[PDB]
Amino acid sequence: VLSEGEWQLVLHVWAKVEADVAGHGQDILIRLFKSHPETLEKFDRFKHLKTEAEMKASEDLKKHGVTVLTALGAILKKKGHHEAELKPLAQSHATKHKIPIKYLEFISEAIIHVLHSRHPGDFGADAQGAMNKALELFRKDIAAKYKELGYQG
């Protein structure tokens, strides 16, 4: 359970993201695919991209980054009261997209790195710890749905 002060730190940096959702979404997906190439393999849509320059040039990748970050932003702004938003995401990522919980840990690491790069003055250690807590809560709650459905592994 995050405290109110931890949520304020999370949402204060998140407000900075929403000024350039698409640029953040590109940096986060590119970092994810570079750091953990097994993740790229889950996207039939993107698995033709073989270089970072090709990734940065893909408008479809940029569109998907906005889809991802729009869904995460709506979850974060519920401050933990996010059951309605996670249900459908857990269900599609477990049963259709086949995304292991561990890859949600990987995209969480990429989100944190990109926020630190783009927003250092609003992403000191207190805010990094709070965002880590928020992303852990996201993963915890998605993992409980995966386990229900027979996908926690």
Residues of each annotated binding site for heme b: 93
Out of 107, 114, 115, 127, point to the residue binding ligand HEM (CB under 6 A): 107
d(CA 55, CA 62): 9
Nearer to ligand HEM, 5 or 147 (CB): 147
d(CA 70, CA 126): 24
Contact in structure between 139 and 123 (CB atoms under 8 Å)? no
Contact in structure between 72 and 114 (CB atoms under 8 Å)? no
Tell me if 115 contacts ligand HEM by CB under 6 A: no
Residue 8 Cβ, how far from ligand HEM at the closest point, in Å? 21
Out of 18, 48, 56, 67, point to the residue binding ligand HEM (CB under 6 A): 67
Tell me if 97 contacts ligand HEM by CB under 6 A: yes
First to last CA, the chain: 25
Nearest residue to ligand HEM, by Cβ distance, number only: 92
Binding-site residues for nitrite: 64
Tell me if 147 contacts ligand HEM by CB under 6 A: no
Residues 36 to 55 in contact with ligand HEM, rule: CB under 6 A: 39, 42-43, 45
Integer angstrom CA distances of residue 50 from 34, 37, 120: 10, 10, 30
